[PDB]
Design a protein around this ligand. Structure first.
Ligand code: NA
Ligand SMILES: [Zn+2]
Ligand SMILES: [Zn+2]
Ligand SMILES: [Zn+2]
Length: 486
Protein backbone atom coordinates (compact mmCIF):
# COMPACT_ATOMS: atom_id res chain seq x y z
CA UNK A 1 0.00 0.00 0.00
CA UNK A 2 1.31 3.55 -0.35
CA UNK A 3 2.31 5.00 3.06
CA UNK A 4 2.16 8.72 3.62
CA UNK A 5 4.77 10.60 5.61
CA UNK A 6 4.49 10.68 9.44
CA UNK A 7 2.30 13.53 10.64
CA UNK A 8 4.33 16.74 11.20
CA UNK A 9 5.29 17.19 14.84
CA UNK A 10 2.60 19.87 15.34
CA UNK A 11 -0.08 17.13 15.32
CA UNK A 12 0.54 16.03 18.91
CA UNK A 13 0.15 19.58 20.29
CA UNK A 14 -3.45 19.69 21.63
CA UNK A 15 -3.30 23.47 21.06
CA UNK A 16 -2.36 23.38 17.40
CA UNK A 17 -4.91 20.71 16.44
CA UNK A 18 -7.60 22.81 18.15
CA UNK A 19 -7.04 25.54 15.51
CA UNK A 20 -8.01 25.83 11.83
CA UNK A 21 -4.27 26.06 11.13
CA UNK A 22 -3.40 22.72 12.68
CA UNK A 23 -6.35 20.39 12.15
CA UNK A 24 -6.14 20.40 8.29
CA UNK A 25 -2.36 19.85 8.25
CA UNK A 26 -2.91 16.76 10.42
CA UNK A 27 -5.70 15.31 8.24
CA UNK A 28 -3.68 13.40 5.65
CA UNK A 29 -5.29 12.19 2.44
CA UNK A 30 -3.23 8.99 2.64
CA UNK A 31 -4.92 8.21 5.96
CA UNK A 32 -8.38 8.87 4.51
CA UNK A 33 -7.55 6.62 1.55
CA UNK A 34 -6.73 3.73 3.88
CA UNK A 35 -10.18 4.11 5.44
CA UNK A 36 -11.63 4.14 1.93
CA UNK A 37 -9.77 0.90 1.20
CA UNK A 38 -11.33 -0.65 4.31
CA UNK A 39 -14.81 0.32 3.10
CA UNK A 40 -13.95 -1.10 -0.33
CA UNK A 41 -12.92 -4.33 1.41
CA UNK A 42 -16.12 -4.36 3.47
CA UNK A 43 -18.09 -4.05 0.22
CA UNK A 44 -16.16 -6.88 -1.46
CA UNK A 45 -16.87 -9.23 1.47
CA UNK A 46 -20.61 -8.41 1.47
CA UNK A 47 -21.85 -8.90 -2.12
CA UNK A 48 -20.24 -5.70 -3.42
CA UNK A 49 -22.40 -3.04 -1.70
CA UNK A 50 -22.86 -1.21 1.60
CA UNK A 51 -26.58 -0.55 1.20
CA UNK A 52 -29.09 -0.09 4.01
CA UNK A 53 -30.28 -3.37 5.57
CA UNK A 54 -27.33 -5.37 4.20
CA UNK A 55 -24.35 -6.99 5.94
CA UNK A 56 -22.23 -4.50 4.00
CA UNK A 57 -23.84 -1.62 5.88
CA UNK A 58 -23.58 -3.43 9.22
CA UNK A 59 -19.86 -4.01 8.71
CA UNK A 60 -19.54 -0.31 7.81
CA UNK A 61 -21.23 0.59 11.10
CA UNK A 62 -18.89 -1.75 13.00
CA UNK A 63 -15.82 -0.16 11.42
CA UNK A 64 -16.92 3.41 12.21
CA UNK A 65 -17.92 2.50 15.77
CA UNK A 66 -14.70 0.62 16.47
CA UNK A 67 -12.55 3.45 15.08
CA UNK A 68 -14.38 6.03 17.20
CA UNK A 69 -13.99 3.94 20.36
CA UNK A 70 -10.25 3.53 19.74
CA UNK A 71 -10.13 7.33 19.87
CA UNK A 72 -11.93 7.50 23.23
CA UNK A 73 -15.44 8.29 21.97
CA UNK A 74 -18.63 6.91 23.42
CA UNK A 75 -20.52 5.80 20.31
CA UNK A 76 -24.29 5.84 19.92
CA UNK A 77 -25.56 3.38 17.32
CA UNK A 78 -29.13 4.52 16.83
CA UNK A 79 -31.52 2.00 15.25
CA UNK A 80 -34.72 2.85 13.46
CA UNK A 81 -37.28 0.79 11.51
CA UNK A 82 -37.15 1.36 7.79
CA UNK A 83 -39.15 0.10 4.80
CA UNK A 84 -36.67 -0.86 2.07
CA UNK A 85 -37.60 -0.59 -1.62
CA UNK A 86 -36.19 -2.89 -4.31
CA UNK A 87 -36.92 -2.44 -8.05
CA UNK A 88 -36.96 -5.96 -9.50
CA UNK A 89 -37.68 -5.53 -13.22
CA UNK A 90 -39.01 -3.00 -15.74
CA UNK A 91 -42.61 -1.85 -15.65
CA UNK A 92 -45.40 -2.66 -18.09
CA UNK A 93 -48.22 -0.41 -19.29
CA UNK A 94 -50.70 -1.01 -22.10
CA UNK A 95 -54.23 0.01 -23.00
CA UNK A 96 -56.76 -2.77 -23.63
CA UNK A 97 -59.95 -0.73 -24.27
CA UNK A 98 -60.99 0.87 -26.62
CA UNK A 99 -57.91 -0.15 -28.61
CA UNK A 100 -54.63 -1.98 -27.82
CA UNK A 101 -51.62 0.29 -27.28
CA UNK A 102 -48.27 -0.61 -25.72
CA UNK A 103 -46.46 2.21 -23.93
CA UNK A 104 -42.70 2.51 -23.71
CA UNK A 105 -40.79 1.91 -20.49
CA UNK A 106 -38.89 5.02 -19.33
CA UNK A 107 -40.33 7.12 -22.15
CA UNK A 108 -44.10 7.06 -21.68
CA UNK A 109 -44.08 6.15 -17.98
CA UNK A 110 -41.88 5.22 -15.03
CA UNK A 111 -42.14 4.09 -11.42
CA UNK A 112 -42.68 6.24 -8.36
CA UNK A 113 -39.81 5.36 -6.05
CA UNK A 114 -41.12 3.47 -2.98
CA UNK A 115 -44.21 2.20 -4.83
CA UNK A 116 -45.79 -1.13 -3.98
CA UNK A 117 -45.72 -3.85 -6.60
CA UNK A 118 -48.85 -4.59 -8.56
CA UNK A 119 -50.43 -6.17 -11.61
CA UNK A 120 -53.84 -4.58 -12.25
CA UNK A 121 -56.19 -3.89 -15.16
CA UNK A 122 -59.08 -1.51 -14.55
CA UNK A 123 -61.07 1.43 -15.79
CA UNK A 124 -59.08 4.66 -15.61
CA UNK A 125 -60.88 7.51 -13.85
CA UNK A 126 -59.47 11.07 -14.05
CA UNK A 127 -59.52 12.90 -10.71
CA UNK A 128 -59.89 16.69 -10.43
CA UNK A 129 -57.80 17.60 -13.46
CA UNK A 130 -56.76 21.16 -14.44
CA UNK A 131 -55.11 20.86 -17.84
CA UNK A 132 -53.45 23.61 -19.82
CA UNK A 133 -50.68 26.17 -19.62
CA UNK A 134 -50.43 27.99 -16.30
CA UNK A 135 -52.79 25.63 -14.46
CA UNK A 136 -52.44 25.25 -10.68
CA UNK A 137 -53.62 21.68 -10.34
CA UNK A 138 -54.51 20.31 -6.93
CA UNK A 139 -55.47 16.96 -8.46
CA UNK A 140 -55.95 14.30 -5.78
CA UNK A 141 -54.69 16.50 -2.94
CA UNK A 142 -57.95 16.41 -0.96
CA UNK A 143 -60.20 13.58 0.12
CA UNK A 144 -63.22 15.34 -1.40
CA UNK A 145 -61.60 15.02 -4.84
CA UNK A 146 -62.55 11.33 -4.61
CA UNK A 147 -66.21 11.70 -3.55
CA UNK A 148 -66.91 10.62 -7.14
CA UNK A 149 -64.30 7.89 -7.38
CA UNK A 150 -65.58 4.33 -8.04
CA UNK A 151 -63.53 1.81 -6.09
CA UNK A 152 -61.41 -0.56 -8.13
CA UNK A 153 -60.58 2.03 -10.77
CA UNK A 154 -57.09 3.25 -11.61
CA UNK A 155 -56.81 6.87 -10.49
CA UNK A 156 -55.46 9.21 -13.17
CA UNK A 157 -54.00 12.09 -11.15
CA UNK A 158 -52.26 15.28 -12.29
CA UNK A 159 -49.08 16.47 -10.61
CA UNK A 160 -49.44 19.60 -8.52
CA UNK A 161 -49.44 21.45 -5.17
CA UNK A 162 -49.10 18.48 -2.78
CA UNK A 163 -46.85 15.45 -2.47
CA UNK A 164 -47.23 12.35 -4.64
CA UNK A 165 -47.48 10.35 -1.39
CA UNK A 166 -50.47 12.45 -0.36
CA UNK A 167 -52.14 11.98 -3.76
CA UNK A 168 -51.56 8.23 -3.76
CA UNK A 169 -52.65 7.67 -0.14
CA UNK A 170 -55.87 9.60 -0.76
CA UNK A 171 -56.52 7.46 -3.84
CA UNK A 172 -55.97 4.33 -1.73
CA UNK A 173 -58.42 5.50 0.95
CA UNK A 174 -60.97 5.81 -1.88
CA UNK A 175 -60.38 2.22 -3.00
CA UNK A 176 -58.26 2.81 -6.10
CA UNK A 177 -56.58 -0.25 -7.59
CA UNK A 178 -53.56 1.75 -8.76
CA UNK A 179 -52.49 5.32 -9.38
CA UNK A 180 -51.08 7.06 -12.48
CA UNK A 181 -49.64 10.54 -11.83
CA UNK A 182 -48.84 12.63 -14.90
CA UNK A 183 -46.64 15.73 -15.05
CA UNK A 184 -48.42 19.01 -14.39
CA UNK A 185 -47.94 20.64 -17.78
CA UNK A 186 -48.43 24.16 -16.39
CA UNK A 187 -45.27 25.12 -18.30
CA UNK A 188 -43.64 23.54 -21.35
CA UNK A 189 -40.83 22.32 -19.05
CA UNK A 190 -43.07 20.15 -16.84
CA UNK A 191 -44.38 17.72 -19.46
CA UNK A 192 -41.80 14.89 -19.46
CA UNK A 193 -40.88 12.14 -17.03
CA UNK A 194 -39.14 12.91 -13.72
CA UNK A 195 -37.40 11.15 -10.85
CA UNK A 196 -40.31 11.01 -8.40
CA UNK A 197 -41.05 9.23 -5.12
CA UNK A 198 -43.98 8.43 -2.85
CA UNK A 199 -41.52 8.24 0.06
CA UNK A 200 -40.35 5.61 2.54
CA UNK A 201 -43.42 6.42 4.69
CA UNK A 202 -45.87 5.53 1.88
CA UNK A 203 -48.73 3.41 3.26
CA UNK A 204 -51.05 3.30 0.24
CA UNK A 205 -50.64 -0.38 -0.64
CA UNK A 206 -51.33 0.11 -4.37
CA UNK A 207 -48.88 0.62 -7.28
CA UNK A 208 -48.07 4.16 -8.41
CA UNK A 209 -46.45 5.23 -11.70
CA UNK A 210 -45.57 8.56 -13.36
CA UNK A 211 -46.37 9.57 -16.96
CA UNK A 212 -45.86 12.39 -19.46
CA UNK A 213 -48.30 15.29 -19.59
CA UNK A 214 -49.52 14.53 -23.10
CA UNK A 215 -50.17 10.89 -22.16
CA UNK A 216 -52.30 11.92 -19.20
CA UNK A 217 -54.17 14.42 -21.38
CA UNK A 218 -54.86 11.81 -24.06
CA UNK A 219 -55.91 9.17 -21.52
CA UNK A 220 -58.23 11.71 -19.87
CA UNK A 221 -59.92 12.18 -23.26
CA UNK A 222 -60.39 8.44 -23.92
CA UNK A 223 -63.84 7.29 -22.75
CA UNK A 224 -63.98 3.66 -21.59
CA UNK A 225 -60.19 3.54 -21.28
CA UNK A 226 -58.64 0.55 -19.51
CA UNK A 227 -54.92 0.27 -18.81
CA UNK A 228 -52.96 -2.87 -17.97
CA UNK A 229 -50.39 -1.77 -15.40
CA UNK A 230 -47.55 -3.86 -13.95
CA UNK A 231 -44.93 -2.73 -11.42
CA UNK A 232 -42.14 -5.17 -10.59
CA UNK A 233 -40.74 -4.20 -7.17
CA UNK A 234 -40.57 -5.37 -3.55
CA UNK A 235 -40.79 -3.46 -0.26
CA UNK A 236 -39.73 -4.97 3.08
CA UNK A 237 -39.83 -3.65 6.63
CA UNK A 238 -36.31 -3.81 8.05
CA UNK A 239 -33.92 -1.95 10.35
CA UNK A 240 -30.91 0.29 9.86
CA UNK A 241 -28.85 2.68 11.98
CA UNK A 242 -27.23 6.07 12.41
CA UNK A 243 -23.86 6.33 14.17
CA UNK A 244 -23.50 9.43 16.38
CA UNK A 245 -20.65 10.52 18.66
CA UNK A 246 -19.54 13.83 20.12
CA UNK A 247 -16.54 15.31 21.87
CA UNK A 248 -16.42 15.19 25.66
CA UNK A 249 -15.09 18.76 25.68
CA UNK A 250 -16.84 21.83 24.40
CA UNK A 251 -19.94 23.80 25.29
CA UNK A 252 -22.88 21.36 25.00
CA UNK A 253 -25.30 24.22 24.34
CA UNK A 254 -23.44 25.41 21.22
CA UNK A 255 -22.94 22.21 19.21
CA UNK A 256 -21.16 22.24 15.85
CA UNK A 257 -22.50 19.17 14.03
CA UNK A 258 -20.96 17.41 11.01
CA UNK A 259 -22.57 14.63 8.99
CA UNK A 260 -21.88 12.24 6.13
CA UNK A 261 -24.15 9.41 5.04
CA UNK A 262 -22.60 5.99 5.41
CA UNK A 263 -24.80 3.87 3.11
CA UNK A 264 -24.25 3.03 -0.56
CA UNK A 265 -26.81 2.37 -3.21
CA UNK A 266 -27.59 -1.29 -3.73
CA UNK A 267 -25.77 -1.15 -7.09
CA UNK A 268 -22.25 -0.65 -5.75
CA UNK A 269 -19.71 -0.12 -2.98
CA UNK A 270 -20.40 3.65 -2.73
CA UNK A 271 -16.77 4.63 -2.19
CA UNK A 272 -17.00 8.18 -3.53
CA UNK A 273 -20.72 8.28 -2.67
CA UNK A 274 -20.27 8.47 0.20
CA UNK A 275 -17.27 6.59 1.57
CA UNK A 276 -15.32 9.79 0.81
CA UNK A 277 -17.36 12.01 3.13
CA UNK A 278 -17.64 9.24 5.73
CA UNK A 279 -13.90 8.46 5.74
CA UNK A 280 -12.74 12.07 5.78
CA UNK A 281 -15.12 12.88 8.64
CA UNK A 282 -13.95 9.83 10.62
CA UNK A 283 -10.30 10.83 10.28
CA UNK A 284 -11.28 14.28 11.53
CA UNK A 285 -13.18 12.90 14.56
CA UNK A 286 -10.11 10.82 15.46
CA UNK A 287 -7.92 13.93 15.33
CA UNK A 288 -10.48 16.01 17.29
CA UNK A 289 -10.30 13.58 20.23
CA UNK A 290 -7.14 15.50 21.24
CA UNK A 291 -8.51 18.98 20.62
CA UNK A 292 -9.68 21.55 23.18
CA UNK A 293 -12.77 22.93 21.42
CA UNK A 294 -14.77 25.82 22.80
CA UNK A 295 -17.92 24.39 21.19
CA UNK A 296 -18.86 20.71 21.36
CA UNK A 297 -18.48 18.88 18.06
CA UNK A 298 -20.95 16.11 17.23
CA UNK A 299 -20.31 13.67 14.38
CA UNK A 300 -23.00 11.72 12.52
CA UNK A 301 -22.81 8.94 9.95
CA UNK A 302 -26.32 8.61 8.51
CA UNK A 303 -28.18 5.48 7.51
CA UNK A 304 -30.44 5.08 4.49
CA UNK A 305 -29.70 8.40 2.82
CA UNK A 306 -30.04 6.68 -0.54
CA UNK A 307 -33.69 5.92 0.32
CA UNK A 308 -34.52 9.61 0.70
CA UNK A 309 -32.46 10.94 3.64
CA UNK A 310 -34.31 8.64 6.06
CA UNK A 311 -31.64 8.44 8.77
CA UNK A 312 -30.73 12.13 8.99
CA UNK A 313 -34.37 13.24 8.83
CA UNK A 314 -35.27 10.83 11.65
CA UNK A 315 -32.44 12.04 13.88
CA UNK A 316 -33.45 15.71 13.72
CA UNK A 317 -37.19 15.05 14.08
CA UNK A 318 -36.56 12.98 17.22
CA UNK A 319 -34.69 15.74 19.05
CA UNK A 320 -36.67 17.48 21.76
CA UNK A 321 -37.02 21.24 21.00
CA UNK A 322 -34.46 22.08 23.70
CA UNK A 323 -32.04 19.63 22.06
CA UNK A 324 -32.61 20.91 18.51
CA UNK A 325 -31.82 24.43 19.76
CA UNK A 326 -28.37 23.34 20.99
CA UNK A 327 -27.19 22.70 17.40
CA UNK A 328 -25.74 25.98 16.10
CA UNK A 329 -24.59 24.73 12.67
CA UNK A 330 -24.57 21.58 10.54
CA UNK A 331 -21.90 20.78 7.93
CA UNK A 332 -22.67 18.14 5.29
CA UNK A 333 -20.06 16.16 3.36
CA UNK A 334 -21.55 14.07 0.53
CA UNK A 335 -19.20 13.13 -2.37
CA UNK A 336 -15.85 14.91 -2.02
CA UNK A 337 -13.61 12.60 -4.03
CA UNK A 338 -15.15 12.73 -7.50
CA UNK A 339 -12.75 11.52 -10.23
CA UNK A 340 -13.53 14.47 -12.51
CA UNK A 341 -14.22 16.88 -9.64
CA UNK A 342 -15.01 20.53 -9.46
CA UNK A 343 -14.67 22.47 -6.19
CA UNK A 344 -18.30 23.10 -5.22
CA UNK A 345 -19.45 24.90 -2.06
CA UNK A 346 -23.07 24.87 -0.91
CA UNK A 347 -24.68 28.15 -2.09
CA UNK A 348 -25.85 29.10 1.37
CA UNK A 349 -26.49 32.79 0.60
CA UNK A 350 -28.43 31.98 -2.59
CA UNK A 351 -26.05 34.09 -4.72
CA UNK A 352 -25.99 31.53 -7.57
CA UNK A 353 -29.34 29.73 -7.58
CA UNK A 354 -31.65 31.95 -5.50
CA UNK A 355 -32.19 29.60 -2.51
CA UNK A 356 -30.87 30.86 0.84
CA UNK A 357 -30.23 28.63 3.84
CA UNK A 358 -31.30 29.59 7.37
CA UNK A 359 -29.51 32.59 8.93
CA UNK A 360 -25.84 31.77 9.41
CA UNK A 361 -25.63 29.60 6.28
CA UNK A 362 -24.14 32.55 4.40
CA UNK A 363 -21.34 32.88 6.96
CA UNK A 364 -20.55 29.17 6.77
CA UNK A 365 -20.32 29.42 2.98
CA UNK A 366 -17.95 32.38 3.33
CA UNK A 367 -15.64 30.27 5.52
CA UNK A 368 -15.42 27.55 2.86
CA UNK A 369 -14.84 30.24 0.22
CA UNK A 370 -12.03 31.70 2.32
CA UNK A 371 -10.21 28.39 2.69
CA UNK A 372 -10.11 27.66 -1.05
CA UNK A 373 -8.94 31.22 -1.78
CA UNK A 374 -6.29 30.87 0.94
CA UNK A 375 -4.95 27.86 -0.94
CA UNK A 376 -4.81 29.52 -4.36
CA UNK A 377 -7.70 27.35 -5.60
CA UNK A 378 -10.89 28.21 -7.42
CA UNK A 379 -14.37 27.25 -6.25
CA UNK A 380 -17.99 27.92 -7.15
CA UNK A 381 -21.53 27.42 -5.90
CA UNK A 382 -23.75 24.35 -5.98
CA UNK A 383 -27.47 23.94 -5.27
CA UNK A 384 -28.94 23.36 -1.80
CA UNK A 385 -32.58 22.48 -2.53
CA UNK A 386 -32.76 19.54 -0.11
CA UNK A 387 -30.60 17.10 -2.07
CA UNK A 388 -28.55 15.71 0.85
CA UNK A 389 -28.72 15.06 4.60
CA UNK A 390 -28.72 18.76 5.55
CA UNK A 391 -32.37 18.74 4.40
CA UNK A 392 -34.08 18.30 7.77
CA UNK A 393 -31.58 20.68 9.39
CA UNK A 394 -32.53 23.18 6.65
CA UNK A 395 -36.23 22.47 7.24
CA UNK A 396 -35.63 23.16 10.96
CA UNK A 397 -34.01 26.58 10.46
CA UNK A 398 -30.50 25.45 11.46
CA UNK A 399 -27.52 27.11 9.73
CA UNK A 400 -25.74 24.75 7.36
CA UNK A 401 -23.08 24.48 4.68
CA UNK A 402 -21.09 21.83 2.90
CA UNK A 403 -18.80 20.74 0.09
CA UNK A 404 -19.37 18.75 -3.09
CA UNK A 405 -17.08 17.59 -5.90
CA UNK A 406 -19.89 16.84 -8.35
CA UNK A 407 -21.96 13.87 -9.49
CA UNK A 408 -23.94 13.27 -12.68
CA UNK A 409 -23.65 16.83 -14.00
CA UNK A 410 -21.24 17.45 -16.88
CA UNK A 411 -18.05 19.50 -16.46
CA UNK A 412 -18.00 22.72 -18.52
CA UNK A 413 -15.03 23.99 -20.50
CA UNK A 414 -14.55 26.75 -17.94
CA UNK A 415 -14.64 24.31 -15.02
CA UNK A 416 -12.05 22.16 -16.78
CA UNK A 417 -9.85 25.26 -16.98
CA UNK A 418 -10.42 25.98 -13.28
CA UNK A 419 -10.15 22.47 -11.85
CA UNK A 420 -8.44 20.32 -14.48
CA UNK A 421 -9.99 17.09 -15.69
CA UNK A 422 -12.15 16.61 -18.77
CA UNK A 423 -14.80 19.02 -20.00
CA UNK A 424 -17.92 17.30 -21.32
CA UNK A 425 -17.78 14.36 -18.90
CA UNK A 426 -19.63 13.85 -15.64
CA UNK A 427 -17.91 14.89 -12.43
CA UNK A 428 -18.42 11.23 -11.35
CA UNK A 429 -19.30 8.99 -14.28
CA UNK A 430 -19.58 6.11 -11.76
CA UNK A 431 -22.15 7.83 -9.51
CA UNK A 432 -24.56 5.27 -8.03
CA UNK A 433 -22.95 2.49 -10.08
CA UNK A 434 -20.90 -0.65 -9.62
CA UNK A 435 -17.68 1.15 -10.57
CA UNK A 436 -17.90 3.63 -7.66
CA UNK A 437 -15.01 1.78 -6.04
CA UNK A 438 -11.66 2.70 -4.60
CA UNK A 439 -10.28 3.35 -8.09
CA UNK A 440 -12.95 6.04 -8.65
CA UNK A 441 -11.42 8.41 -6.04
CA UNK A 442 -9.47 11.52 -7.06
CA UNK A 443 -6.97 11.97 -4.22
CA UNK A 444 -6.33 15.63 -5.08
CA UNK A 445 -10.04 16.40 -4.72
CA UNK A 446 -10.21 14.34 -1.54
CA UNK A 447 -7.24 16.14 0.01
CA UNK A 448 -8.37 19.72 -0.60
CA UNK A 449 -11.97 19.06 0.41
CA UNK A 450 -11.00 17.16 3.60
CA UNK A 451 -8.63 20.01 4.46
CA UNK A 452 -11.50 22.46 3.85
CA UNK A 453 -13.79 20.33 6.02
CA UNK A 454 -11.20 20.40 8.82
CA UNK A 455 -10.70 24.16 8.49
CA UNK A 456 -14.35 25.15 8.88
CA UNK A 457 -15.13 22.54 11.56
CA UNK A 458 -12.14 23.70 13.62
CA UNK A 459 -13.10 27.36 13.11
CA UNK A 460 -16.66 26.90 14.38
CA UNK A 461 -15.45 24.67 17.22
CA UNK A 462 -13.55 27.74 18.50
CA UNK A 463 -16.10 30.44 17.64
CA UNK A 464 -19.58 30.40 16.09
CA UNK A 465 -19.57 34.22 16.12
CA UNK A 466 -20.03 34.56 12.36
CA UNK A 467 -23.12 32.34 12.54
CA UNK A 468 -24.36 34.08 15.71
CA UNK A 469 -24.06 37.50 14.07
CA UNK A 470 -26.22 36.53 11.08
CA UNK A 471 -28.83 34.91 13.35
CA UNK A 472 -29.17 38.12 15.37
CA UNK A 473 -29.30 40.41 12.32
CA UNK A 474 -32.21 38.33 10.98
CA UNK A 475 -34.28 38.61 14.19
CA UNK A 476 -41.37 25.22 -0.58
CA UNK A 477 -39.85 21.75 -0.80
CA UNK A 478 -39.99 20.11 -4.23
CA UNK A 479 -37.05 17.72 -3.74
CA UNK A 480 -35.97 15.38 -0.92
CA UNK A 481 -32.74 13.62 -1.81
CA UNK A 482 -32.49 12.26 -5.33
CA UNK A 483 -36.20 12.45 -6.27
CA UNK A 484 -38.97 15.01 -6.33
CA UNK A 485 -41.67 14.50 -3.69
CA UNK A 486 -44.18 16.75 -5.52
NA1 NA B 1 -57.93 18.94 -5.25
ZN1 LIG C 1 -24.45 10.69 -1.40
ZN1 LIG D 1 -25.98 8.81 -3.54
ZN1 LIG E 1 -23.23 31.85 -2.76
Amino acid sequence: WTPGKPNPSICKSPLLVSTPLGLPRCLQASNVVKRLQKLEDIASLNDGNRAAATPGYQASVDYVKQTLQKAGYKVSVQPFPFTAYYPKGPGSLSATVPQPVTYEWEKDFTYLSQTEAGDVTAKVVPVDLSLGAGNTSTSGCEAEDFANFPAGSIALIQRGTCNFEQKAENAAAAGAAGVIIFNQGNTDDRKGLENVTVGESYEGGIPVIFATYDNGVAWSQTPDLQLHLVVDVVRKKTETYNVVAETRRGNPNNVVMVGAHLDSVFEGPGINDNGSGSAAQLEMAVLLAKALPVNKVRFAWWGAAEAGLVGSTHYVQNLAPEEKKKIKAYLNFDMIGSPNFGNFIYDGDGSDFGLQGPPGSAAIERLFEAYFRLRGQQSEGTEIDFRSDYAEFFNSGIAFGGLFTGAEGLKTEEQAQKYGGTAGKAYDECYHSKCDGIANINQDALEIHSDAMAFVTSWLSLSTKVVDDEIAAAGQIERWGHDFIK
